[PDB]
Coordinates of C-alpha atoms (C1' of nucleotides) in Angstrom, one line a residue:
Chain A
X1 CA -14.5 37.4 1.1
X2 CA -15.6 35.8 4.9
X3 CA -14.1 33.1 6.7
X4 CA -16.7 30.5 6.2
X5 CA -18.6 29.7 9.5
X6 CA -17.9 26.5 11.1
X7 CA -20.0 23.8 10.0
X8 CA -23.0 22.1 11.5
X9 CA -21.9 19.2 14.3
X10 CA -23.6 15.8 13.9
X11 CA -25.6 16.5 17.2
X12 CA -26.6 19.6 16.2
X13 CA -27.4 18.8 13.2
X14 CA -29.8 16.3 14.6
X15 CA -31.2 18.8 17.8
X16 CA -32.2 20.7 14.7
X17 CA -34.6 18.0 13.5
X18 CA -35.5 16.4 16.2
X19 CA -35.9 20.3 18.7
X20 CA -40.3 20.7 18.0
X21 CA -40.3 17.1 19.5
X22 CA -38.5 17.8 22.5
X23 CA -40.7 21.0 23.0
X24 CA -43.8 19.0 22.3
X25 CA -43.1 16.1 24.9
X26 CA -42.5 18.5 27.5
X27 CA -44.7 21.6 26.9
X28 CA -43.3 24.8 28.5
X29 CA -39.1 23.4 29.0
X30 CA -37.4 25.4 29.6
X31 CA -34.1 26.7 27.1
X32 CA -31.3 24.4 29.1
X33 CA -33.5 21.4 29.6
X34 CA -33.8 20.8 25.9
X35 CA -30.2 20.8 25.3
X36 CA -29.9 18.5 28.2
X37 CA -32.9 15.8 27.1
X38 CA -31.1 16.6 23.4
X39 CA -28.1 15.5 25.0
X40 CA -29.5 12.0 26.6
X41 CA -31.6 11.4 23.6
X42 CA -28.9 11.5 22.0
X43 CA -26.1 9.7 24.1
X44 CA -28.8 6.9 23.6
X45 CA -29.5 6.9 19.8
X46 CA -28.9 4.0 18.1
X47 CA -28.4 4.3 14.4
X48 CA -26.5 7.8 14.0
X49 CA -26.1 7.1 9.7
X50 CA -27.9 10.4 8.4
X51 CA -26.4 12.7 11.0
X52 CA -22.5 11.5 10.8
X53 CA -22.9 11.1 7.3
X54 CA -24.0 15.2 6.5
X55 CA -21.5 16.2 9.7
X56 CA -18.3 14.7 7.4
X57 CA -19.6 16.1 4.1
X58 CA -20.4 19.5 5.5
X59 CA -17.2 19.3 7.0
X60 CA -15.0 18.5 3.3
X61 CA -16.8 21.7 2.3
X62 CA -16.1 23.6 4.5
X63 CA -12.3 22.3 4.7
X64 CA -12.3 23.3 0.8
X65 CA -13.9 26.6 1.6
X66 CA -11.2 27.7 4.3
X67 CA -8.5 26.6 1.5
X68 CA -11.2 28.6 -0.9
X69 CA -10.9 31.6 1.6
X70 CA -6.8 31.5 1.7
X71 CA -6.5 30.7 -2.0
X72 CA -8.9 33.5 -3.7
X73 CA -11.2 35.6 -1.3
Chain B
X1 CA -12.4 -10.3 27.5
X2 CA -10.2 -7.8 25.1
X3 CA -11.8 -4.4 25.2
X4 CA -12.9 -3.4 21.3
X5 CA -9.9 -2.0 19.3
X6 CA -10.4 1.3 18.0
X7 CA -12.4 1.8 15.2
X8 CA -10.8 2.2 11.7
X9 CA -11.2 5.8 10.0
X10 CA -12.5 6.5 7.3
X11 CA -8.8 6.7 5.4
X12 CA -7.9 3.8 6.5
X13 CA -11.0 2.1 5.5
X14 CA -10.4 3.4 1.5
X15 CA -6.6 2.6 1.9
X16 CA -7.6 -1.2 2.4
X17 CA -9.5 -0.9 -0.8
X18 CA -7.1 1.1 -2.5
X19 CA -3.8 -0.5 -1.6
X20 CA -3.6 -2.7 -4.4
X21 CA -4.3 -0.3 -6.9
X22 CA -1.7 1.7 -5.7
X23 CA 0.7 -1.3 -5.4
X24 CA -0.7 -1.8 -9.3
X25 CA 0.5 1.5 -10.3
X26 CA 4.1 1.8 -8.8
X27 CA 5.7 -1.4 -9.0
X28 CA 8.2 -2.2 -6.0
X29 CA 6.9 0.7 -4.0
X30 CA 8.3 0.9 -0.6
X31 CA 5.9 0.7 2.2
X32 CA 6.3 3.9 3.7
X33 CA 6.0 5.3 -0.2
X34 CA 2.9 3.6 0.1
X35 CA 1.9 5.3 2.5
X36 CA 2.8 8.5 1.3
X37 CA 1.0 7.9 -1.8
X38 CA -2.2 6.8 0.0
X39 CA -2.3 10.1 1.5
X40 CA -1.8 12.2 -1.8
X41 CA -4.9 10.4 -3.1
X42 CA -7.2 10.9 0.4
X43 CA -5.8 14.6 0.1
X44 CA -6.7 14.9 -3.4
X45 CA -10.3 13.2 -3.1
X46 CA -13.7 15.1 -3.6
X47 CA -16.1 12.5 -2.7
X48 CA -15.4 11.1 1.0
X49 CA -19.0 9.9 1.5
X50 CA -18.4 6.1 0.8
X51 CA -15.5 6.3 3.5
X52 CA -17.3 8.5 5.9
X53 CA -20.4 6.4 5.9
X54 CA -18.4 3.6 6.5
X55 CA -16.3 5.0 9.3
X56 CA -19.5 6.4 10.9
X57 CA -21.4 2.8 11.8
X58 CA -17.4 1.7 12.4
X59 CA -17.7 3.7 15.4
X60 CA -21.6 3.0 16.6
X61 CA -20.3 -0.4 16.0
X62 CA -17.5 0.5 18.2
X63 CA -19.4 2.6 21.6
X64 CA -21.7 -0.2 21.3
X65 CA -19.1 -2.4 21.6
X66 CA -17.2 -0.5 24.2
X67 CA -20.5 0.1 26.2
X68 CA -21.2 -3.6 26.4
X69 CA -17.1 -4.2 27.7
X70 CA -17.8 -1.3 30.7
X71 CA -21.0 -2.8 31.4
X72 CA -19.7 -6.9 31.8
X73 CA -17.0 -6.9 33.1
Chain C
X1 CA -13.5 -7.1 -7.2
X2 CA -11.7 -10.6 -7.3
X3 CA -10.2 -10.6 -10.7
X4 CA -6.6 -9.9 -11.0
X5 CA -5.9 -6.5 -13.4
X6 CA -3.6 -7.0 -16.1
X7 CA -0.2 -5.5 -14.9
X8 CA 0.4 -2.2 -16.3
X9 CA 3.0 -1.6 -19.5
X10 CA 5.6 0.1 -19.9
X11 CA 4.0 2.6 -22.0
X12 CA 1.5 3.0 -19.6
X13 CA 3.9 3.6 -16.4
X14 CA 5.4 6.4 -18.3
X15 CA 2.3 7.9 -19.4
X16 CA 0.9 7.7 -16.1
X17 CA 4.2 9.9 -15.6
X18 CA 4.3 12.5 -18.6
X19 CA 0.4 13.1 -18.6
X20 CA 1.2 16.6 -16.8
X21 CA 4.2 17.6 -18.9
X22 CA 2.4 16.8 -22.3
X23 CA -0.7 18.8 -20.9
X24 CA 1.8 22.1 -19.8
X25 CA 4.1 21.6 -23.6
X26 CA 0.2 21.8 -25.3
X27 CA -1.7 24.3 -23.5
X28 CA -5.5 23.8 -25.0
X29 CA -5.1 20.2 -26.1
X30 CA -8.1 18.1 -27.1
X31 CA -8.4 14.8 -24.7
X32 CA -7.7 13.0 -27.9
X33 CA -4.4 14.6 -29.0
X34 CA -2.8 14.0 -25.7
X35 CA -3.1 10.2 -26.4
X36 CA -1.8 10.5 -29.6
X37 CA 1.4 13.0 -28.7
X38 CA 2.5 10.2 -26.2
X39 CA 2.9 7.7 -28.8
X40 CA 4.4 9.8 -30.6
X41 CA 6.8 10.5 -27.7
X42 CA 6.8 7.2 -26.9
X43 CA 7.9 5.8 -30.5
X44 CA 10.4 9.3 -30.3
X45 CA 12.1 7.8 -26.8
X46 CA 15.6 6.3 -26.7
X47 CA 16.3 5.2 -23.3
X48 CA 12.8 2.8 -22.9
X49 CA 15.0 1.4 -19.8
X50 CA 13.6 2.8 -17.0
X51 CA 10.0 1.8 -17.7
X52 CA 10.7 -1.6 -19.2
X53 CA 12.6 -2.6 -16.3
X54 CA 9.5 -1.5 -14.2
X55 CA 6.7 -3.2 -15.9
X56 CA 8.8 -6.4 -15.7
X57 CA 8.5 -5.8 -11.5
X58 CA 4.9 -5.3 -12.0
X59 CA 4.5 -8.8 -13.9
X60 CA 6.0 -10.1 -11.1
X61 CA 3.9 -8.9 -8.4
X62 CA 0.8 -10.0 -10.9
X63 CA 1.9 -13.7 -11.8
X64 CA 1.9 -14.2 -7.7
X65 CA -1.8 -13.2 -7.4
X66 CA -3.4 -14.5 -11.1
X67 CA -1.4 -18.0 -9.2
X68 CA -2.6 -17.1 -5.7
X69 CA -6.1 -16.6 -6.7
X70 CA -6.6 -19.4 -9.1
X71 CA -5.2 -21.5 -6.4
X72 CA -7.1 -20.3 -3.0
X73 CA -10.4 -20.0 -4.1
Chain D
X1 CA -14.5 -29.5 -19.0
X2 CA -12.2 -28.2 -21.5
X3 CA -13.0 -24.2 -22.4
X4 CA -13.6 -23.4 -26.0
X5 CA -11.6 -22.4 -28.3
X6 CA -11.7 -18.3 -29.4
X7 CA -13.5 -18.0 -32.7
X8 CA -11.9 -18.0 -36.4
X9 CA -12.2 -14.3 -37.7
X10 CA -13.6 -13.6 -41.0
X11 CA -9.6 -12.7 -42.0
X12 CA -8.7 -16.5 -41.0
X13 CA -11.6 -18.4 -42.4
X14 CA -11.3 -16.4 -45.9
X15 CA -7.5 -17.7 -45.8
X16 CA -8.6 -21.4 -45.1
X17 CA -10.3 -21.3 -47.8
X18 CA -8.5 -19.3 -50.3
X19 CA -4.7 -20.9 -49.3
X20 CA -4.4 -23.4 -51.5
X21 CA -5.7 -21.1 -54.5
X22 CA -2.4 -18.5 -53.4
X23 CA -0.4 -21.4 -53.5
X24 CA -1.5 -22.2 -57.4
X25 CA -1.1 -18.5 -58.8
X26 CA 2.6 -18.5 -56.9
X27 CA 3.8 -22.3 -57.1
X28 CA 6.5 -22.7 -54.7
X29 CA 5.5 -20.2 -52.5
X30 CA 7.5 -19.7 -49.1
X31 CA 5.1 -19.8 -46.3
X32 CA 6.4 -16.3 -45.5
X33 CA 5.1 -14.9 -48.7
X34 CA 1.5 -16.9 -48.4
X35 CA 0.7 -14.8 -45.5
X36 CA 2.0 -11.5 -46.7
X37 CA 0.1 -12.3 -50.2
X38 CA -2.9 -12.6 -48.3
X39 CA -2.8 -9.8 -46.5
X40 CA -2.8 -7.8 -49.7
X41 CA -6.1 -9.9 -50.7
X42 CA -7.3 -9.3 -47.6
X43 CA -7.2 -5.4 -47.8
X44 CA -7.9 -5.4 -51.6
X45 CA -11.4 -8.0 -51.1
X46 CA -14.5 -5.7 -51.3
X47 CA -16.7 -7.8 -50.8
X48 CA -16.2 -9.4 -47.4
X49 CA -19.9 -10.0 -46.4
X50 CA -19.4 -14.2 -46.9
X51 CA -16.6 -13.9 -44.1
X52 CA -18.3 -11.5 -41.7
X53 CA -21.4 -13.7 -42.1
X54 CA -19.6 -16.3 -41.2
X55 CA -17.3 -15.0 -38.8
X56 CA -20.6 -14.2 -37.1
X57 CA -22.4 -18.0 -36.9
X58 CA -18.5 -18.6 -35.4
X59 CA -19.1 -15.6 -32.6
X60 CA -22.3 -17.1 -32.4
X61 CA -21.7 -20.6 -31.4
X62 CA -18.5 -19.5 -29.6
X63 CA -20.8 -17.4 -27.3
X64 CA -23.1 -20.1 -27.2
X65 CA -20.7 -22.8 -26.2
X66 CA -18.9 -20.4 -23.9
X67 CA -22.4 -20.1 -21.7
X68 CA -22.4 -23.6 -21.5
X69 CA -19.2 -24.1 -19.7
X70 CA -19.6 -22.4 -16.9
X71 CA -22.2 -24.3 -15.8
X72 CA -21.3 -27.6 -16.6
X73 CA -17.6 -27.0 -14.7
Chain E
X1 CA -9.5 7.0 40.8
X2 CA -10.1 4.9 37.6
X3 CA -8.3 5.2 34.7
X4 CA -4.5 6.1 34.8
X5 CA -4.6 8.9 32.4
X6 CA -1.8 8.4 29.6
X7 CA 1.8 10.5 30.6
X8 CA 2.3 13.8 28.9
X9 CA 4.6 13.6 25.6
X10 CA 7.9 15.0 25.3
X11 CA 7.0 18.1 23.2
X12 CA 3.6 18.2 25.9
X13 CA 5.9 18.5 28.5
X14 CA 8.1 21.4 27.3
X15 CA 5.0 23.0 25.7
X16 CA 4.0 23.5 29.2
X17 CA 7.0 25.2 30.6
X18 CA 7.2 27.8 27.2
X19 CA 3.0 28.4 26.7
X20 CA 3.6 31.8 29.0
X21 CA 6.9 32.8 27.0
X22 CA 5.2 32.0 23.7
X23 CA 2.2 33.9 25.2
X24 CA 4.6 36.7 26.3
X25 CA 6.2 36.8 22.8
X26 CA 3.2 37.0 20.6
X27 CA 0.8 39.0 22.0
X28 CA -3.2 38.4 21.2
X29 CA -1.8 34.9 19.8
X30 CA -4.9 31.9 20.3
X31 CA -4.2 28.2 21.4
X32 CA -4.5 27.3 17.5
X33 CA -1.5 29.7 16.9
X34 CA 0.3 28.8 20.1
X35 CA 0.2 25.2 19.5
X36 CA 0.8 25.9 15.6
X37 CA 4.5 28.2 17.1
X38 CA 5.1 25.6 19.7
X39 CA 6.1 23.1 16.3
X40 CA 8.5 25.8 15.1
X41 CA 10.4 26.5 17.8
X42 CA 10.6 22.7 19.2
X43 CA 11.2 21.2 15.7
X44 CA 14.8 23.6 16.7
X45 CA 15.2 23.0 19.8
X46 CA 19.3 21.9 20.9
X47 CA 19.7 19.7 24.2
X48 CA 15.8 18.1 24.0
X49 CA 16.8 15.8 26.7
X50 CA 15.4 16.8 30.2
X51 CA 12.3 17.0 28.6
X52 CA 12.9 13.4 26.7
X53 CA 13.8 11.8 30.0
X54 CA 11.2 13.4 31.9
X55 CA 8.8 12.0 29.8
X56 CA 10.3 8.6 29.9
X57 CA 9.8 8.7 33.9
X58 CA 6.0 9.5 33.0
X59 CA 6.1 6.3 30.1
X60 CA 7.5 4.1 32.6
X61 CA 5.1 5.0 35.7
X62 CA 1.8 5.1 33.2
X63 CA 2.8 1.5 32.1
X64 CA 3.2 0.1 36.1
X65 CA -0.2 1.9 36.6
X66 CA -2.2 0.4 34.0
X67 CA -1.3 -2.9 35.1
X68 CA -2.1 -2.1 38.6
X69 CA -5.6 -0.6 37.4
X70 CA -6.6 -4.0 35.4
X71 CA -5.6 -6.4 38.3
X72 CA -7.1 -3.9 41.4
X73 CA -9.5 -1.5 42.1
Chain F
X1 CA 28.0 8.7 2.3
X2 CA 26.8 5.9 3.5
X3 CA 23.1 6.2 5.5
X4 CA 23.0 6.4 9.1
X5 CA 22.2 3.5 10.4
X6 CA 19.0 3.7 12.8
X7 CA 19.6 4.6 16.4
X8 CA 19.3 1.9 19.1
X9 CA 16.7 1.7 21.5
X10 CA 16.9 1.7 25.2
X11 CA 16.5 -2.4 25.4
X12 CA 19.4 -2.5 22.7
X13 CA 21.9 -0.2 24.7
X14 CA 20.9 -2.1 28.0
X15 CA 21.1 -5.3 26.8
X16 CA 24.8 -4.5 25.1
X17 CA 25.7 -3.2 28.5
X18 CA 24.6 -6.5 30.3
X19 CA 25.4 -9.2 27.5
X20 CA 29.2 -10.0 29.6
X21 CA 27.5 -9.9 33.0
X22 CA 24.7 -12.4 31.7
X23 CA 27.4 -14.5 30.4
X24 CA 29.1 -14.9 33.6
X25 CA 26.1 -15.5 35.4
X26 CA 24.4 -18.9 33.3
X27 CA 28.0 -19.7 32.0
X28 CA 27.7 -21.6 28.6
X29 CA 24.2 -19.6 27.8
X30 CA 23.4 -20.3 24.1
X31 CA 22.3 -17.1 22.3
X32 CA 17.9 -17.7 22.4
X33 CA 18.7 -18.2 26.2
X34 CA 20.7 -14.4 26.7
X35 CA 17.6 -12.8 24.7
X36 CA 15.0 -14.3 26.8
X37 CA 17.3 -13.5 29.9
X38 CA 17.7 -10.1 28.8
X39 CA 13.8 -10.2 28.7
X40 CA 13.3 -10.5 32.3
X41 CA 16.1 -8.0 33.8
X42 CA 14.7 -5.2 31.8
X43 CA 10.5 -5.8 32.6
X44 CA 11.5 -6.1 36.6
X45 CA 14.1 -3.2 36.3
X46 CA 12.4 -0.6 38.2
X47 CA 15.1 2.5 37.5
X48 CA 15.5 2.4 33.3
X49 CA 16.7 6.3 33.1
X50 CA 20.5 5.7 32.5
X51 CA 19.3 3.9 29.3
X52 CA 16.2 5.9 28.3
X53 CA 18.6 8.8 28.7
X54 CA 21.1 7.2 26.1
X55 CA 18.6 6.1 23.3
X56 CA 17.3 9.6 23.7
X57 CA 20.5 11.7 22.9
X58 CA 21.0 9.0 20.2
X59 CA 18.0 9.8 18.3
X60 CA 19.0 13.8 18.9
X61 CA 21.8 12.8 17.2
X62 CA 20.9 10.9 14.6
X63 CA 17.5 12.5 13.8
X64 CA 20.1 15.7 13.0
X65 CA 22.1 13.6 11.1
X66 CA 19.0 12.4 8.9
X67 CA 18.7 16.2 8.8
X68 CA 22.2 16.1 6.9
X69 CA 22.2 13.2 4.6
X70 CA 18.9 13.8 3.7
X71 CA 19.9 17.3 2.5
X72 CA 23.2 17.6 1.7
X73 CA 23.3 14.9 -1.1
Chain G
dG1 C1' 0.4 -23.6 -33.6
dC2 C1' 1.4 -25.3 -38.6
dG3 C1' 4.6 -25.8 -43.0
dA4 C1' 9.5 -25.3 -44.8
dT5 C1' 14.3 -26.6 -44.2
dA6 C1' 18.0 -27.2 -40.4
dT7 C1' 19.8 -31.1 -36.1
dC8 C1' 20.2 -35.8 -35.0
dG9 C1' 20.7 -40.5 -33.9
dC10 C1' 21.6 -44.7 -35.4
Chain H
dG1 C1' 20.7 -41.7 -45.8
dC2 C1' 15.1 -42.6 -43.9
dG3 C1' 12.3 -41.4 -38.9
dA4 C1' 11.9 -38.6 -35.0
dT5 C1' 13.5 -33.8 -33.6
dA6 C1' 14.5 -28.9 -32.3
dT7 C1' 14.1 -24.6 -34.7
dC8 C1' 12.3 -20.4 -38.3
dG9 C1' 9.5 -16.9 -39.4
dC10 C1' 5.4 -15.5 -40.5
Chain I
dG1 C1' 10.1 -12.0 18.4
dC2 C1' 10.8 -7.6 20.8
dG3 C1' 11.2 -2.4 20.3
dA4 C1' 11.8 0.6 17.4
dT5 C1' 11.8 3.7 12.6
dA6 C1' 8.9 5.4 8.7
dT7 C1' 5.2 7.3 6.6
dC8 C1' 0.3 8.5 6.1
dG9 C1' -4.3 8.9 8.8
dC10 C1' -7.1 9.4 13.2
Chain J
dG1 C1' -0.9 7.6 22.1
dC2 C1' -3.6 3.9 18.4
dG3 C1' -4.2 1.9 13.6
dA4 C1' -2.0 -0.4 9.3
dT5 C1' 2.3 -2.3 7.3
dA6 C1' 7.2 -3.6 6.5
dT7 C1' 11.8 -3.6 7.8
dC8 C1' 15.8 -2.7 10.8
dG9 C1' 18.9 -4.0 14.5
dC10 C1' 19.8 -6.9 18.1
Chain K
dG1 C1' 23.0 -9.5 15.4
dC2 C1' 24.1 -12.2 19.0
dG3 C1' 27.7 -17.0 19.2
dA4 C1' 27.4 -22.1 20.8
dT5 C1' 27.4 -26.3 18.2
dA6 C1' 27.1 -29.0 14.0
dT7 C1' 28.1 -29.9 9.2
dC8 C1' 30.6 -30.2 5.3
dG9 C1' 34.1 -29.8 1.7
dC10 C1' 39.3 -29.6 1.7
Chain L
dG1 C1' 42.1 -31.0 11.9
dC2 C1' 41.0 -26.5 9.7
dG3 C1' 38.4 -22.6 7.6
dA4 C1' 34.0 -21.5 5.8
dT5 C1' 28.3 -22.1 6.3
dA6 C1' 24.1 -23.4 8.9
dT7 C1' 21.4 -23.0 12.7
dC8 C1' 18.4 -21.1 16.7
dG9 C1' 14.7 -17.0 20.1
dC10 C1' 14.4 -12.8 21.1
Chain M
dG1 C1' -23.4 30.6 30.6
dC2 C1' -24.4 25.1 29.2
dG3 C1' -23.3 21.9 26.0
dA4 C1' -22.2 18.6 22.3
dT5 C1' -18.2 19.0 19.4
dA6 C1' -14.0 21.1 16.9
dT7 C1' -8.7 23.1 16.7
dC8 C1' -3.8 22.3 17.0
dG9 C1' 0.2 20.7 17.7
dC10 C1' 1.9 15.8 19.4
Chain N
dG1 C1' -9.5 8.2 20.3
dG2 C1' -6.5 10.7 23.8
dC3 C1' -4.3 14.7 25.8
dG4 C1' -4.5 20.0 27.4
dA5 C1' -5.8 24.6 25.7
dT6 C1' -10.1 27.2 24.5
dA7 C1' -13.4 28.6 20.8
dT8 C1' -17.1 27.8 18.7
dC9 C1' -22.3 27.8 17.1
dG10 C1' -27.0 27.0 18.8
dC11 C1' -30.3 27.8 21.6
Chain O
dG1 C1' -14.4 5.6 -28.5
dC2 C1' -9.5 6.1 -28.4
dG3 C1' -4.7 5.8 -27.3
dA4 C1' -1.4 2.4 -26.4
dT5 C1' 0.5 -2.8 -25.7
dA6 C1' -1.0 -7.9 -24.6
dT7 C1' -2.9 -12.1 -26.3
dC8 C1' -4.7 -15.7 -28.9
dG9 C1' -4.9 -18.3 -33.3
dC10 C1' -2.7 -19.6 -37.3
Chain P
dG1 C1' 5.4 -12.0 -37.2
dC2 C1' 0.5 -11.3 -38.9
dG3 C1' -4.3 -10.3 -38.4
dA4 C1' -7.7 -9.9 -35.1
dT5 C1' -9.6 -9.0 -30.5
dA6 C1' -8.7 -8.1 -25.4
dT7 C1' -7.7 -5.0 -21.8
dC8 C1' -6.8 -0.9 -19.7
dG9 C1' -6.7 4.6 -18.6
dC10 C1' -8.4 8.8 -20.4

DNA sequence: GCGATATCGC
DNA sequence: GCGATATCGC
DNA sequence: GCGATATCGC
DNA sequence: GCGATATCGC
DNA sequence: GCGATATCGC
DNA sequence: GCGATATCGC
DNA sequence: GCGATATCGC
DNA sequence: GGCGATATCGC
DNA sequence: GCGATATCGC
DNA sequence: GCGATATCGC
């Protein structure tokens, strides 16, 4: 029926948690400046077990979707 | 000293666990059958998560590893 | 997992080999009747050749770990 | 120390006691025939509740002594 | 600089004297269907070797680079 | 038909090449000695093509001829 | 591994 | 043959 | 004991 | 390419 | 396999 | 003394 | 458009 | 993980 | 539990 | 070889 959308990276996945914390640290930044402080938070994270974990799984789905899409659809 | 090895994947993390079984179920299997075999199983698998997990802290392990190499040297 | 499985027979090489035509010759088989049909196919074999000569390889492989394991811890 | 021996079933601790009585009613008797005859016995006894009993005190102690042996290796 | 990045594979190599011819061919075609069409028409390609030897040239430079990078600068 | 035998690297053709002139050149050279001669030449020789060139059009070759066994019975 | 006759060694 | 044996068939 | 092939996966 | 794993050819 | 150098049974 | 096997690093 | 990551063949 | 081409999805 | 063979005791 | 119970894949 419609090529499944891409799924969720692990980073993103995480941004999306972790974006009303960013905001609230720095009140007023800017739209760039979150993905940039998003992007050395999370160059320095330390135990990424949650967000690669989800990132894979949502990613099998998604593999057995597409096949989904190309088998039935 | 050595710089880290590359982390093992997630497949190759089940295969080690799984090699036996397979060796178990088709006696005097040739390596490369093996092989083969290993990947009709991964292919045909539902539930990654173990592996995935598993593979995921096998690469933090790994950048922190590699980080530490870069950094003292 | 330290145990050594019991090396697969004969019987259960081929079954591990006929499960798909048995399921496609009875088309709405109870998960019982399939078990029973291969001993009856079993029993109904001639040439038992093939999978004797395989289990025997198997036994092999297995008398090498049950002797490795009992040995090195 | 030495592991135990498996248990005595209900079937072979009937026969121990009810051999020698075989023998009598069938003087002569080939060895052969003994355990066929008591087969037939066996299947015909309907009351089996003395053998089951105990062929359960011989579960019982085997169990019991079985415990005991892997601690005192 | 750093790093001696690793020498382009055979395929690689060809791949990027035929991209514009493949591009040329298939109009509206996308990196994912280029790359996919590349396959096809190497896997049946006839006299492979300027390519293989030019790539061989790369092997054989990359390896007296590397060792140059982990003893100098 | 017999398999094709697995095409011979670049070290192999070399070294067949350069066996004879070896010989003359440590006269009385036991076989370990020629191998770890052969070694030596090859890491300091600086222009390999002639020979990556060869074991290139030899796997051509036999990689089509893997092609035909592995096809026509 | 036991209870019969079937090998065995002197 | 009489005592120690491999073997027999459940 | 080196330099590959052979088969999957990354 | 690297990994894992065995074997081939010399 | 590559083959110099021993070994071993005729 | 002469064929047939055994060895060893890469 | 930045930006972490993903697609494809190897 | 590494390459050399974008092509995404999330702001 | 259920299908099969494998194993232990006698 | 017989009964009984173990083990294994579904």
């Amino acid at each position: 029926s419609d090529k499944p959308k891409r799924p969720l990276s692990a980073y993103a996945l995480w941004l999306n948690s972790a974006r009303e914390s960013i905001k609230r640290e720095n009140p007023g930044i800017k739209v760039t400046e979150v993905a940039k402080r998003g992007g050395e938070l999370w160059r320095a994270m330390k135990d990424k077990s949650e967000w690669e974990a989800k990132a894979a799984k949502a990613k099998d789905d998604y593999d057995r979707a597409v096949k989904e899409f190309e088998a039935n659809g």
